Write a protein that binds this ligand. Structure first.
Ligand SMILES: CC(=O)SCCNC(=O)CCNC(=O)[C@H](O)C(C)(C)COP(=O)(O)OP(=O)(O)OC[C@H]1O[C@@H](n2cnc3c(N)ncnc32)[C@H](O)[C@@H]1OP(=O)(O)O
Length: 230
């Protein structure tokens, strides 16, 4: 039988367990948790969807964030206090285009925001996992761009990172988001490098190759995971 495997060098086999999982006494007893992260342009949402198709319960942190500071949500009042009512649409919802203009590319302002929002999202993620476990789910994935920067590896058994070369990342960002190349590198500089992410990962994946190769990696990763679940 002839086949190909995917590797990262400076060897790490993509899909394999690279270092031991974390012990997590505080998580619900029936539940295994993956933290899924990657650099912008990594295509990690494609990977999250493939894990969803295999049966994982996905918690999308970006969405939880938007709900956290929806009117009625725990972060609404603090975010509006911290940034002012000029960030609000006419209907009183946060205008994320205006908020983004305040914080993107701006280290101090983004920190005012994430100091408020990240703890709120982490709490909402913990709540969602509890509900999922009550409804019989046994494997949860917290999909988060800034997982390691937020310290959220404390909430997961395994960190899974989706990586691609920085040149392809910048290309995907510039093209798909209509960013200037400087805005794209600004985005990338404002987060951990692929190598930093890899070093702190239990499993590494890549969307560098065509879609069928990504699927194969994810299936291989999923199968190995299943055999090491408690
Ligand atoms: C720990 C976590 O990962 S929590 C989930 C991420 N959320 C946060 O960090 C909270 C702060 N960010 C926000 O509130 C919003 O991103 C806003 C208001 C700044 C912008 O909102 P929107 O314009 O709707 O952008 P959206 O939320 O879709 O994010 C756009 C991109 O910026 C990224 N991004 C979001 N927050 C951050 C951050 N703190 N630092 C760097 N990049 C970020 C997103 O992951 C997304 O990347 P993608 O296009 O590769 O998926």
């Amino acid at each position: 039988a002839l086949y190909q495997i995917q590797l990262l060098k400076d060897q790490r086999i993509l899909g394999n367990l690279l270092q031991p999982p974390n012990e997590r006494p505080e998580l619900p007893s029936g539940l295994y948790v993956l933290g899924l992260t990657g650099i912008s342009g990594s295509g990690k949402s494609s990977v999250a969807q493939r894990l969803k198709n295999l049966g994982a319960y996905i918690i999308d942190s970006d969405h939880l964030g938007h709900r956290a500071y929806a009117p009625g949500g725990p972060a609404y009042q603090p975010v509006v206090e911290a940034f002012g009512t000029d960030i609000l649409h006419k209907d009183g919802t946060i205008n994320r285009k205006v908020l983004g203009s305040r914080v993107f590319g701006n280290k101090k302002q983004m920190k005012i925001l994430t100091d408020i929002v990240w703890p709120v999202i982490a709490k909402l993620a913990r709540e969602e996992m509890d509900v999922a476990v009550a409804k019989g789910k046994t494997l949860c994935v917290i999909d988060a761009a800034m997982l390691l920067e937020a310290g959220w590896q404390s909430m997961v058994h395994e960190v899974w990172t989706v990586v691609i070369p920085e040149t392809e990342a910048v290309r995907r960002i510039v093209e798909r988001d209509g960013l200037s190349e400087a805005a794209a590198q600004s985005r990338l500089q404002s987060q951990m490098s692929g190598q930093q992410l890899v070093e702190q990962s239990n499993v590494v994946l890549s969307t560098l190759w065509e879609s069928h190769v990504t699927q194969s990696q994810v299936e291989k990763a999923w199968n190995l995971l299943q055999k090491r679940l408690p």
